[PDB]
Amino acid sequence: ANGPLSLLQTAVRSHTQVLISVRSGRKLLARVKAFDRHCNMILENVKEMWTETPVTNGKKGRPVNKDRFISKMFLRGDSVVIVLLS
Amino acid sequence: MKLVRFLMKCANETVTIELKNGAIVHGTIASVTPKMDTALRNVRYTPKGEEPYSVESLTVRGNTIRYYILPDSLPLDTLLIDDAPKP
Amino acid sequence: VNPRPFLQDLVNQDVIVRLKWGQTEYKGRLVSIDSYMNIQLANTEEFINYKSTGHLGQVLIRCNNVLWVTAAAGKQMTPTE
Amino acid sequence: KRWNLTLPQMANLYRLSEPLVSDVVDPNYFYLFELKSFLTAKALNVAL
Amino acid sequence: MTSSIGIPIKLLNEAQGHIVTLELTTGQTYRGKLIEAEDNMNVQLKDITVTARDGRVSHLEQIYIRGSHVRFFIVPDMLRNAPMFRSRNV
Amino acid sequence: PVYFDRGFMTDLMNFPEQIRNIALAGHLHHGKTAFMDMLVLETHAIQERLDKRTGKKRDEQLRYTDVHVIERDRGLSIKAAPMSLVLSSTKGKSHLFNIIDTPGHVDFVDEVAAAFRLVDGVCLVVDVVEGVQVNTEQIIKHAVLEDIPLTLIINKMDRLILELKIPPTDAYFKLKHVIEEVNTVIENTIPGRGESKRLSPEKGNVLFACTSMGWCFTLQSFAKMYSESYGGVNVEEFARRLWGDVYFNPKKRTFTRKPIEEGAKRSFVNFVMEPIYKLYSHTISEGPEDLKRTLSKLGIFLKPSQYKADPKVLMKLVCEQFFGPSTAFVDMVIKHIPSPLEAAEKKLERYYTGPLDTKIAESMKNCDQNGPLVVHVTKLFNTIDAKSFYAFGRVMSGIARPGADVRVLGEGYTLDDEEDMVVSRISDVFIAETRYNIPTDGVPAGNFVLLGGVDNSIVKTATIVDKKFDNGEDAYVFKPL
Amino acid sequence: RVLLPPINFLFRLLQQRTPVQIWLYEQLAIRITGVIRGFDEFMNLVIDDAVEIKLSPKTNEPESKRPLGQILLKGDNISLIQALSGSA
Amino acid sequence: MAPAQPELKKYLDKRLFVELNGSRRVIGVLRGYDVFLNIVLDDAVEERPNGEKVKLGMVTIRGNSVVILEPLE
Amino acid sequence: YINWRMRVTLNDGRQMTGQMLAFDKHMNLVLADTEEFRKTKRMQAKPNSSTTQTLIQEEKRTLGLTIVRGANIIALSVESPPP
Amino acid sequence: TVSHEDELFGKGNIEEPEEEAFVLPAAVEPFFADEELETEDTRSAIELWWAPYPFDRRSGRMVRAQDVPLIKHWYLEHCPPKQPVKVRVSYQKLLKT
Numbered sequence A: 001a002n003g004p005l006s007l008l009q010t011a012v013r014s015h016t017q018v019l020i021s022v023r024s025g026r027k028l029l030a031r032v033k034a035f036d037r038h039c040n041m042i043l044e045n046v047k048e049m050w051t052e053t054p055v056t057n058g059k060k061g062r063p064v065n066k067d068r069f070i071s072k073m074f075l076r077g078d079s080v081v082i083v084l085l086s
Numbered sequence B: 001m002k003l004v005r006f007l008m009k010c011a012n013e014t015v016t017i018e019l020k021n022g023a024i025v026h027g028t029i030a031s032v033t034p035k036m037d038t039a040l041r042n043v044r045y046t047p048k049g050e051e052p053y054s055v056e057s058l059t060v061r062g063n064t065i066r067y068y069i070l071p072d073s074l075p076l077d078t079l080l081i082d083d084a085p086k087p
Numbered sequence C: 001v002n003p004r005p006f007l008q009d010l011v012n013q014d015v016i017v018r019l020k021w022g023q024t025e026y027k028g029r030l031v032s033i034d035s036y037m038n039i040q041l042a043n044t045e046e047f048i049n050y051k052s053t054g055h056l057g058q059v060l061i062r063c064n065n066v067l068w069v070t071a072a073a074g075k076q077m078t079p080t081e
Numbered sequence D: 001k002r003w004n005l006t007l008p009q010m011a012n013l014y015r016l017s018e019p020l021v022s023d024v025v026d027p028n029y030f031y032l033f034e035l036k037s038f039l040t041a042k043a044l045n046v047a048l
Numbered sequence E: 001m002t003s004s005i006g007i008p009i010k011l012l013n014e015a016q017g018h019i020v021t022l023e024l025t026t027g028q029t030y031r032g033k034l035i036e037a038e039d040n041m042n043v044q045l046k047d048i049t050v051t052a053r054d055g056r057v058s059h060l061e062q063i064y065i066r067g068s069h070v071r072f073f074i075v076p077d078m079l080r081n082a083p084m085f086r087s088r089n090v
Numbered sequence F: 001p002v003y004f005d006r007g008f009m010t011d012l013m014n015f016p017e018q019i020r021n022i023a024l025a026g027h028l029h030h031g032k033t034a035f036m037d038m039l040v041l042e043t044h045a046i047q048e049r050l051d052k053r054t055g056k057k058r059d060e061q062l063r064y065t066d067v068h069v070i071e072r073d074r075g076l077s078i079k080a081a082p083m084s085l086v087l088s089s090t091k092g093k094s095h096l097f098n099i100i101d102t103p104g105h106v107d108f109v110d111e112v113a114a115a116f117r118l119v120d121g122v123c124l125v126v127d128v129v130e131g132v133q134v135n136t137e138q139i140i141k142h143a144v145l146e147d148i149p150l151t152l153i154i155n156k157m158d159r160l161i162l163e164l165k166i167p168p169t170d171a172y173f174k175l176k177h178v179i180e181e182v183n184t185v186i187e188n189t190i191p192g193r194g195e196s197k198r199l200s201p202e203k204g205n206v207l208f209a210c211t212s213m214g215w216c217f218t219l220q221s222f223a224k225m226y227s228e229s230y231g232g233v234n235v236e237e238f239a240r241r242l243w244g245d246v247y248f249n250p251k252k253r254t255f256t257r258k259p260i261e262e263g264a265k266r267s268f269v270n271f272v273m274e275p276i277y278k279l280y281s282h283t284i285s286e287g288p289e290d291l292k293r294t295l296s297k298l299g300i301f302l303k304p305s306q307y308k309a310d311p312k313v314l315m316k317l318v319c320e321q322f323f324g325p326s327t328a329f330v331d332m333v334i335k336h337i338p339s340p341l342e343a344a345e346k347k348l349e350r351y352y353t354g355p356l357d358t359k360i361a362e363s364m365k366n367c368d369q370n371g372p373l374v375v376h377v378t379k380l381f382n383t384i385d386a387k388s389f390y391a392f393g394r395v396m397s398g399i400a401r402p403g404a405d406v407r408v409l410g411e412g413y414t415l416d417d418e419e420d421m422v423v424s425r426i427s428d429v430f431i432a433e434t435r436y437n438i439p440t441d442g443v444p445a446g447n448f449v450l451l452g453g454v455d456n457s458i459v460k461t462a463t464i465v466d467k468k469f470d471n472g473e474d475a476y477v478f479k480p481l
Numbered sequence G: 001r002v003l004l005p006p007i008n009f010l011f012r013l014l015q016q017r018t019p020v021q022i023w024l025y026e027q028l029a030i031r032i033t034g035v036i037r038g039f040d041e042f043m044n045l046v047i048d049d050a051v052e053i054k055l056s057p058k059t060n061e062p063e064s065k066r067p068l069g070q071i072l073l074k075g076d077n078i079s080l081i082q083a084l085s086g087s088a
Numbered sequence H: 001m002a003p004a005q006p007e008l009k010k011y012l013d014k015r016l017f018v019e020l021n022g023s024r025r026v027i028g029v030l031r032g033y034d035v036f037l038n039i040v041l042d043d044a045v046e047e048r049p050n051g052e053k054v055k056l057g058m059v060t061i062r063g064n065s066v067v068i069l070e071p072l073e
Numbered sequence I: 001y002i003n004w005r006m007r008v009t010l011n012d013g014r015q016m017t018g019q020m021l022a023f024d025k026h027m028n029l030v031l032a033d034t035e036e037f038r039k040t041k042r043m044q045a046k047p048n049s050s051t052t053q054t055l056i057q058e059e060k061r062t063l064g065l066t067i068v069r070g071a072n073i074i075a076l077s078v079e080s081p082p083p
Numbered sequence J: 001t002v003s004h005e006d007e008l009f010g011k012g013n014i015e016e017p018e019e020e021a022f023v024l025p026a027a028v029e030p031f032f033a034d035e036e037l038e039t040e041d042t043r044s045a046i047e048l049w050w051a052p053y054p055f056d057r058r059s060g061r062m063v064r065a066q067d068v069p070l071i072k073h074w075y076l077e078h079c080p081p082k083q084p085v086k087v088r089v090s091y092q093k094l095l096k097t
């Protein structure tokens, strides 16, 4: 309501896209469907991208950004580095 | 509102579990604890790059999970009703 | 100065968020704070390794991923020699 | 077939029974005046 | 709702005075006589022969180890037959 | 049926760190057999068959270790009575207690003396009403002169509430009078050395018990239950501030020597005796609804059919809900009475006739399980048909095993005179519980043993050693009683 | 013998205005030097005149100085607090 | 239930060895503790893997940084 | 599910199998007759083949009665019914 | 040689030393502090505690009317002093029965 989590409520009240950086080094782009005080959120229309360096024949290749589309998302709170309300 | 009750309401669903260390679990949910640990059946487990193995049941303890992928046919809006009593 | 009044005195003013990994800092205006002192902060712009990485906007920062937060009243964040 | 009574009821019944209730509290009152000693004296053909 | 001490912590309280072997998450292994134990798994030991994965064999006396930094104890077999493992019929 | 595992108890004998060998001694009818009854009813599932009992027989004391027909008919103990029980401490660690219940009549004090040879410590049971009596003085004097560690059990506390009907301050003065009487006799036995062997509740070697209602506590356990009920309380400091001329000031919350606050009570009266007095008064004085609410205010909950029980049965249920098990007695014996190692060193110093620098004396000093067998037999118990005797003694070295070739050595055995010696054969090992015998294939060092087939050469006491010591060594006898 | 609570030590540092040295939580080369301004029951440290010290990875000498000023440091990152006894 | 005080009563006025995460060592006489075992010491000396001594004075150590205690005597 | 014979995955990838006896609210397991199972990815290079064989070799250890903390548990798996 | 009171305070202090100054937590109260030591039914409760059977009970089974001997304890107890010979002989014959 009046705390920081209200922006997630503002994410609920507007259904806007949100960019989430996670402690695994990956990034999420999703619309916030539900949240709580414990920052456990449920998301819809989810597109998750990350960066990996493929090692081909023992040589470290260039970093490639790839992605995956997930319809329904249950992201757990403590792994989130940071949340950006776009 | 606590999301553990929403974990209670989404039982008997074939989900995919991504853990805090990196292993992947998949299968249909048997039950979930009020401390958000969950026991699951018809389990396939993939570790970091070695061969996956399938077991009939697996009780994964929830402080080491990263996230879930639920079935896309799950009616989230029907589960969003608050059945807990008002204090 | 007690910590909760200290961060209550830094509401809606120029603040630096020194995060906990990756050598990341944020510059902006501390909008709101709870009893767990999570951060809702607006007009965020982000530096990594003391070089600019860019503006983001309205940002929720969880306090467990943060080294510390300070006031930015006339403070330069270039690496001093 | 079964009874249970409260403290005021048992107190009242005990107070009403004082013509016909024993006032002996110590079992040591019955030293050598009990069934075992009577049977022992019967065995020895003596009388307490 | 009084905080009932768990059966594992009860078994750890049974294990004091015996010889236990502790494996920590910080890499150390101790074999020693468990002198003192707490409800939050802080343990004071005596004999403590030391064994790590890098081969740190050493011997010394008296140690305090906190319960957050440990992985698991190994306790004698006879403690399996403790009275806590028999179901009290209620 | 018992509430522990007998295999677990046999595992517990292979550990002479946590074993305690104690004798319960005191004046006639002061409550030693009732203390044993409390421990038995804690450890044995026999309350079910005691509740199937009607008439005057259901009002009888259990008296588990009184098994002689003389003991049953006379209503007093005439023989020593051993048991081995698994008892839990406050922290939850189970220990093996080997406890001998001695008689309290003066004529049978020799049995006490036999028990005093085999035990590491003596729990002296003193009735709070009669206080120290002539047999209490005799037992105190003998246990002090033989340098046996001593603890105090003040029994029959309910009398102070139910028989004397004195206020709790005067109950404190009666308790302090009995404690100082015990300490006076201890000091009169050894003049000048009574400070080292002093019994006082703040030292933790004094236990307050009511054995008819089956409860006991120390000041440490009562401060412990205060800490359990509230939290943040330091048990040892609160316990040592619960005795003496120490008064609690409730607005200042401070313990002083004089009542600097108006209406301040003594700390032992304020925190201990008045809760017990109020517990007794409200249990026996209130109806089922008032008692149910009163006990619910302290978290004490009985079964709904038990609130209309008879006042003695109801009082026993309320007491076992309030005080709990006998963990305070276990704590007192663990803290103030030595293991068989220390008491074995003292025993070999005091009652052994051979040299102490030899290998068998080192096996007896260290309570070595793998050494050669040495047992000091001081008691003989007749069988059910009374044709033969079992030899009751203490395995001090080796393991007593069935079918073992042994030499029984009489009191007159020496090196130059091997006349008083008989080669005999151990047939079956027993753990004695004084109403049943647990058949065992082994009892290690520092424990109590009941052997069969080695009784014939024993007159009063004996020393049972192996047929041959593997180091080629001569054997000696223990001193007579 | 009298016990010293750590919160009593922090209060003594606050009333004495003694500068302190704070190690970061398994950042072995990174410390904070500053005079204490405030603390709470979670020992979150409001610090004044604080400078960040980065130690050398080879011999652990101070390499860089980063003056930062007044900082509320989170309580979960303190490893050790050294009372810097000034030469008076 | 609130956490009880840890059993550090034997270690009062004793020179102790403290092994901390990051393999740090702190050698110093004990001064006091709390119900969480944040530990305050006097005459503190820091020890690194190279084997040198650092003087600290009297210090405090966070409980979660505390891994191992060890009595020298 | 008390006394059911179970296998436990440890934080460092190790396995802890055997007869479980107890558990509490913190998911700490009392586990009897325990066998610790360790996996190491060895590069077994044969003298005749240039390709180093990648094999996850298995090594055993016995412990007996064990007590594992819930802060280092990952997952709980069924091994076998009690014998 | 040293007292328990002259170990807690110190000789004639009549106070805990303020450097140690042990204080209980404010929540700590005696177990039945609000409740009274007695009740108006407590004298009767203790009096009934020592009453002969069945008056020391509060529950039981009902017996036949002819199974209640009202005056049996008269001749199970010692006879009163200064009886006639006939009364004493009757007491002894009821004892014999």
Ligand SMILES: Nc1nc2c(ncn2[C@@H]2O[C@H](COP(=O)(O)OP(=O)(O)OP(=O)(O)O)[C@@H](O)[C@H]2O)c(=O)[nH]1
Binding pocket: F026, F027, F028, F029, F030, F031, F032, F033, F034, F061, F063, F075, F076, F077, F102, F103, F104, F105, F125, F155, F156, F157, F158, F159, F209, F210, F211, F212, F213
């Ligand atoms: N009021 C009261 N009476 C008790 C208590 N404990 C035991 N008694 C009574 O005191 C008598 C003691 O008998 P025992 O149990 O044989 O006492 P003892 O200590 O073994 O004495 P000995 O027979 O000489 O061995 C019994 O008749 C009990 O009814 C008690 O806690 N309170």
Ligand SMILES: [Mg+2]
Binding pocket: F032, F033, F076, F077, F101, F102, F103, F104
């Ligand atoms: Mg007896």
